[model samples]
Target chain A: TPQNITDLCAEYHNTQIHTLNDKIFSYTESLAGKREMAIITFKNGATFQVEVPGSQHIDSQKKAIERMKDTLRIAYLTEAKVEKLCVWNNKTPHAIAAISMAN
Target chain B: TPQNITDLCAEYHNTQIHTLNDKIFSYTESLAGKREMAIITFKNGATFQVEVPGSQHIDSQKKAIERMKDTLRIAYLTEAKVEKLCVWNNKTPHAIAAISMAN
Candidate 1:
């Protein structure tokens, strides 16, 4: 059985958000020390950084998006509407939402 | 007069795409010596880096997106369909998109 885009999201933790400057603006779950994570967007050419706690793979991208709505102030953005995305991880990048669909 | 989402994109140099590791995967226009740029995404929590050739404000986000389609392999992604986006520049993040639209 071949993996799909949705599959990739499984192993990944909730998404974190940041500015292009690589600042830790916000993330899904809060951690005291800085962890590593991934961040990206559909279009608009914006970039964000992400962080995760320990080695847990969780699903908190929704919260991350909600935080973006407040911090980044993108009101139109919603889970159902996003096409492109930014991705990061402590290990190899799983399914790049854009590149994965191409193959 | 306050600037809109489109206005912020104008100051930004086309968009650059990269991974969370802060690697220079690709960009709108090519340059050397590792110039500083911004990178972010709409959702999906993917992070990317961006670079501009000079301090000049330009519009090359289209090419940057095309490169992502190739590098990221996201077939569904196109200029028209992208809602959220990753943004970067040498100066302040004029419009953070999600944050900007909120205000």
Candidate 2:
């Protein structure tokens, strides 16, 4: 989806929970340090990583969080079947953010 | 979203169930018969019309249904606050299809 943001997001149909740090991208090769990566894992088992500029680059946590949510939306629309979506911070340990879907 | 479909679809956050005919678009002008129209109504009250080619153009009900579902995805992502999304046909009367979302 080499297009504007919204339609590009519609390419995914998965749920994700991640941070703006490299911690979540432990397995990705070249995308590890330079760009913040979030993993999109479908319940049906397809998976991929999404890249976004770090919070340091955005210079605002509020803005960075919005970007992260957009990446989740992209993952959500990319597939045809999604039953649940959520995101949380490992540091928080108790925090939870979820988007709902039913088949 | 003068972009490709997926991203463009991400521009809406609403839900609907209309037909490949003019029955659902009873109020819109200039978009009446030439296109298959879908109505998107948000819980927040934002509303809009979407245009797709008629089923006759697609020549297959199966293909037409996919296009219609794509329209729903477009509606779902267009808004930040979306919720209960469901679609049914007047002909089926009891047919119900729903996609779930939780805030």
Candidate 3:
């Protein structure tokens, strides 16, 4: 088992979690009529783009975590430690919910 | 004047600094015998990859700032304000040198 959230994060940092699918990065229209999109390239050379509606900040946050449930489950993260596991960037642009352990 | 760094950042967030070139992300082998690489996509759909020598943490810091000099110039940031302008992620993965203002 992983030692802690940090350990798990380091292991999965930049690497794709097997439990996650491409759906997490789907594209949707934002409030400004621009598509909020992120193109993520995994360590294995596989690249895909995910988009979300450009809504309120909170709405974006909600959608992000909602899509990350499986990733959290596979990483053995509890509901309490979710926020702490939120890493800035591992394999994509912007500060998305990623698991990265500290050095 | 572009206002404070925050205002300037908000204007250039995720967008390329225009003064930067593809050389910023050059690749070099690290001590761990792995190639350190990062691919950045500007807001205008211009994409490129930069590689750096996988050296010490401090070396990476130095090289990062060294390449970012032009970016800082374009953004009108001073040497003292460099650290504060270091954003987590805006157009690429990992907490590389980016400029993002708070909402």
TM-score of chain B of each: 0.23, 0.26, 0.25
Candidate 3 residue-wise lDDT, B1-103, digit = tens: 1212233334434532333222222222233445344444443353433334334233324433333332333223222111122233443443343332111
Give each prediction's DockQ, rounded to 2 decimals: 0.03, 0.03, 0.03
Q: List where candidate 2 sits over 4 angstroms from the true fold.
A: A1-103, B1-59, B80-103
Question: lDDT tens digits, residues A1-103, model 2?
Answer: 0111122123333323322211111222234566444555443344444334443222323332333344355434543233322332332221213232222
User: Which is the leading candidate under TM-score?
Assistant: 2
DockQ category of candidate 3: incorrect
Better of 1 and 2 by lDDT: 2
Report lDDT per candidate: 0.30, 0.33, 0.32
List, residue by residue over B1-103, the lDDT tens digit for candidate 1.
3355455445546443222322222211111113112333323444333332233425565345334423321212222223334355333332122212110
Q: How far is candidate 1 from the true structure (C-alpha RMSD, Å)?
A: 15.8
> What is model 1's native contact fraction?
0.00
Query: Per-residue lDDT of A1-103 in model 1, one digit per residue for the tens?
Result: 0122233334335432222322223223343457434444434345433334333422323333322323222212222233223344343432122111111
What ordering of candidates by lDDT runs from best to worst? Answer: 2, 3, 1
Candidate 3 regions with alpha-carbon error over 4 angstroms = A1-16, A19-34, A48-50, A54-97, A101-103, B1-103
